[PDB]
RNA sequence: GUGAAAUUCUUGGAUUUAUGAAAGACGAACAACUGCGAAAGCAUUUGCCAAGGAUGUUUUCAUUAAUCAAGAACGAAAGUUGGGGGCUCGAAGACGAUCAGAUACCGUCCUAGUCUCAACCAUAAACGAUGCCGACCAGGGAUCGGCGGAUGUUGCAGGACUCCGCCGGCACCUUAUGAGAAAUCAAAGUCUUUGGGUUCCGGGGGGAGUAUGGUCGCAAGGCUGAAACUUAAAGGAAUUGAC
């Protein structure tokens, strides 16, 4: 189930068996590449770039049309963010929780959620260190974390 | 005049110990006759008995004719508040005698004071053990 | 009850149908107990069935206020409108949703008053569900609709029209049919009205709503 | 419906899997599709996702097509819907 | 004998022993 | 030995429930455990309604009802015959009488 | 007020009736084999602040995971240190009553407390007396949240209602072909045909959660925790009598 809850929900996506892009997709790889690069220039991120491609531009799956994942495309183009998206959003949420909890010292339920989110942040940072996706000297400092985001 | 009814208000207050028959003006700031069940009995246990309320109701009926009170609004109530809320044993007889003793009855209402959420009831957490 | 005291007769406002409302007492003149000051009882509970000679509205209660004693009469005025315990206890049923709203609207005459509305969800003609509940996110919208309709029909001319829309169900029906987009909302009307503050006697505006006595 | 002893798991009925959960089917398949929404006027070729999440527009008047909801995007009454497929 | 009151008696004995030991250090 | 599957109360999916006080002894009992009844009766009974009918000023006055939800602890409910002791097989019968 | 009485209040007006102001506590009915939360726990309206499950997804990363010594957050009620508040109720105490006796059960008046703020405590029948994660194995209907479809009514696409289906949750009913000492359990099943992973923890009954040492706490106390000696039974479930 959930790592930090008792839920057992299974809602997710189901990729089609057909790996080839659908026939009606008449967009070349160059157009998709330019769109992804422009979005990454506009401060977007892979998760919220894939949805924009899926909805507005009718691209069901980037890995099908271009043959490679969004993060790989950005890294090859060199536009990839310095911090992975999931860790960035976890750090942002922890910063917001700390900012709220600063003025509410008796809100002893957001302190527990803060402990949970910090544990998740540390686990993800350890994983990214093991695979050399972060500098080995990286460290999550709570006081200066808000400056990062 | 005759036929047309002059109205008083009977604030019957029937607890488990006494029974008050109190006739007032429509405002309630006056008082015509106020007699309890304990006036008509010589033992302070029988005050709540139906017969004591019967006697007290007879007396209120006798008093309320000379001033022209030809009909009553009955406002029956019990202890209310945080204590018991059901009317006492003498609540009915006191009403019934009013009907029997040539007295007209207007609207009948229940005005037991109910709290939306009261203070702590006495007796403790384990309750009154017998 | 004494050989003293005077038998005065109350006068309900002209807005109702029958003005004669029982009889009252007061000390005649003894010492400092002035009859004029002593008759400022200022509260009379009536059923509104007598004031309209119709029996189906017996569930209501009208609180009249004695304003000026003159000509052996008392010349009352509106001071509140509440419910009997019978109707309120009959309405609240299990397997149902109770929605209560209240507002502190103000009239042009500076009569600060508080209004309360009460409503209940209604089962459909073809309903197999045995509960007929509502989600809190819906009862909140119902409460907002109640409040806005209250402040819409109020915030207008003098209280004369306000009680002209109280003895009938104008606020209640309007709330009923302005919320059918959310829930059916059966049995909707004003539970009670509390007068928070009166401007002043004003010395004469009371006679504009009274007959010749 | 004694049990699966009568049906064949290899070749199950073609309509019973139209109702099971997408993950729990014999082979996982999406429940969505892509549709080319046609407006009342011209510019009728815009392609949108069934379970869309962004409020798409049109070049002409921005002609708001769909609202994202908990499920299928709420297409307007004025916009006509036809679907494209593989 | 109720075990609650046995526990209470044990607590009284413990505090009395502590006082006696503090008397002589 | 577990006499009842639900433990004598009606608690599932929660940890705490505020109590009430028995109407006879004022003993604190959990709200779901307490024996709750809803009694609705005429203010005046059949022997009285006849004498109050003609005594009423107008014939259109309907006689008023009274409604009361009462709660009883297990001891008071059993002693007052609100609920009796049932057999082992009839204990599971949750169907109300009639 | 009581089974019955008295202690107490009262012609200086007790109890009762109507109006109004203030104070503190409490949120009836609606309220459910219903909801949320890691548990403790949470029930008037409205605004703000951050958080969360489930559902939907042809979005993204790609093993990042499960359980966990040491080490940490939170933890009813009572209790402790001060400030405020102090309605009701009420340990201690006093009095009345009952009684062979009543430091109790029953009445009345009440102190700490009950409410709140800043700190301590770390225990409950903290219970589902049932650790967490994963797979499989009977049926049924109801219900809560989300979603998909059909449907034909609403003083009104959508909302309310009806029917079918999927995921997630709290439960419930019938039945073993299962298990069990049995009560009973759809998990407490898939166990001599014994092995999915992992943490904690028990070894006849007392002495005893006691002595002592260590350690946390202002204290009350908490965590860890024996031995000598004594004993043939203690105990669980069900059965027939007796009461
Ligand atoms: K019960
Ligand atoms: Mg709904
Ligand atoms: Mg037993
Ligand atoms: Mg839960
Ligand atoms: Mg508990
Ligand atoms: Mg409430
Ligand atoms: Mg609920
Ligand atoms: Mg530990
Ligand atoms: Mg323990
Ligand atoms: Mg549903
Ligand atoms: Mg042993």
UniProtKB/Swiss-Prot annotation, chain E:
Note: Initially thought to be part of the large ribosomal subunit. Crystal structures show eS32/eL41 to be a small ribosomal subunit forming a bridge at the interface of the 2 subunits.
Record keyword Transmembrane helix present: no
GO molecular function: structural constituent of ribosome
Keywords: Ribonucleoprotein, Ribosomal protein
Identification of the protein by name: Small ribosomal subunit protein eS32
Region of interest called Disordered, as start-end residue ranges on this chain: 1-25
GO CC term, one of those recorded: ribonucleoprotein complex
Family statement drawn from the similarity comment of this UniProt entry: Belongs to the eukaryotic ribosomal protein eS32 family.
UniProt cross-references to InterPro entries, sorted A to Z: Ribosomal_eS32
GO biological-process terms attached to the record: translation
Quaternary assembly: Component of the small ribosomal subunit (SSU).
Origin superkingdom: Eukaryota
Source organism: Hordeum vulgare (Barley)
Gene designation per UniProt: RPL41
Keyword Cytoplasm in record: no
């Amino acid at each position: 189930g959930r790592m930090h809850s008792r839920g057992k929900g299974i809602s997710s996506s189901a990729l089609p068996y057909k790996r080839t892009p659908p026939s009606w997709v008449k967009t070349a790889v160059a157009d998709v590449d330019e769109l992804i690069t422009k979005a990454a220039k506009k401060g977007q991120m892979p998760s919220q770039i894939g949805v924009l491609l899926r909805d507005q531009h009718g691209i069901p799956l980037v890995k099908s049309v271009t043959g490679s994942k969004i993060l790989r495309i950005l890294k090859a183009h060199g536009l990839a963010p310095e911090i992975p998206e999931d860790l960035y959003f976890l750090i942002k949420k922890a910063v917001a929780i700390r900012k709220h909890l600063e003025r509410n010292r008796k809100d002893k339920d957001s302190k527990f959620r803060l402990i949970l989110v910090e544990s998740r942040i540390h686990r993800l940072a350890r994983y990214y260190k093991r695979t050399k996706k972060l500098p080995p000297t990286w460290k999550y400092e709570s006081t200066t974390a808000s400056t990062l985001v | 005049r005759e036929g047309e009814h002059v109205f008083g208000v009977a604030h019957i207050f029937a607890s488990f110990n006494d029974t008050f028959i109190h006739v007032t003006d429509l405002s309630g700031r006056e008082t015509l006759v106020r007699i309890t069940g304990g006036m008509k009995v010589k033992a302070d246990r029988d005050e709540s008995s139906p017969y004591a309320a019967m006697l007290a109701s007879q007396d209120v009926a006798t008093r309320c004719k000379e001033l022209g009170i030809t009909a009553l609004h009955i406002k029956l109530r019990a202890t209310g508040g945080n204590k018991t809320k059901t009317p006492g044993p003498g609540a009915q007889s006191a009403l019934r005698a009013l009907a029997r003793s040539g007295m007209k009855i207007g609207r009948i209402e229940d005005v037991t004071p109910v709290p939306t959420d009261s203070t702590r009831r006495k007796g403790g957490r384990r309750g009154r053990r017998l | 009850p004494f050989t003293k005291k005077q038998w005065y007769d109350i006068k309900a406002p002209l807005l109702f149908t029958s003005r004669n409302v029982g009889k009252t007492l007061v000390s005649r003149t003894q010492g400092t107990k002035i009859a004029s000051e002593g008759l400022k009882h200022r509260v009379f509970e009536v059923s509104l069935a007598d004031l309209q000679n119709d029996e189906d509205q017996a569930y209501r209660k009208i609180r009249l206020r004695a304003e000026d004693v003159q000509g052996m009469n008392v010349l009352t005025n509106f001071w509140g409108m509440d419910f009997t315990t019978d109707k309120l206890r009959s309405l609240v049923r299990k397997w149902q949703t109770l929605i209560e709203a209240h507002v502190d609207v103000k009239t042009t005459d500076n009569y600060m008053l508080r209004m309360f509305a009460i409503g209940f969800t209604k089962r459909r003609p073809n309903q197999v569900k045995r509960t007929c509940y509502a989600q809190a996110s819906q009862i909140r919208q119902i409460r907002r609709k109640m409040v806005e309709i209250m402040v819409n029909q109020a915030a207008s001319c003098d209280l004369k029209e306000l009680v002209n829309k109280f003895i009938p169900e104008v606020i209640g029906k309007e709330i009923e049919k302005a919320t059918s987009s959310i829930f059916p909302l059966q049995n909707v009307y004003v539970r009670k009205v509390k007068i928070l503050k009166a401007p002043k006697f004003d010395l004469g505006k009371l006679m504009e709503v009274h007959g010749d006595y | 419906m004694v049990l699966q002893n009568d049906i064949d798991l290899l070749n199950p009925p073609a309509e019973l899997e139209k109702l099971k959960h997408k993950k729990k089917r014999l082979v996982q398949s999406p429940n969505s599709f892509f549709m080319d929404v046609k407006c009342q006027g011209c510019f009728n070729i815009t392609t949108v996702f069934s379970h869309s999440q962004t409020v798409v527009v049109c070049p002409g008047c921005q002609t708001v097509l769909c609202q994202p909801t908990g499920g299928k995007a709420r297409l307007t009454e004025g916009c006509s819907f036809r679907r494209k497929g593989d | 004998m109720r075990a609650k009151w046995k526990k209470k008696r044990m607590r009284r004995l413990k505090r009395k022993r502590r006082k006696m030991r503090q008397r002589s250090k | 030995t577990f006499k009842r599957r639900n433990g004598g109360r009606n608690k599932h999916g929660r940890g705490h429930v505020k109590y009430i006080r028995c109407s006879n002894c004022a003993k604190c009992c959990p709200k779901d455990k307490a024996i709750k009844r809803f009694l609705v009766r005429n203010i005046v009974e059949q022997a009285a309604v006849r004498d109050v009918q003609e005594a009423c000023v107008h014939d259109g006055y309907v006689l008023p009802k009274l409604y009361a939800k009462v709660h009883h602890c297990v001891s008071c409910a059993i002693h007052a015959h609100i609920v009796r002791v049932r057999s082992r097989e009839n204990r599971r019968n949750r169907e109300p009488p009639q």
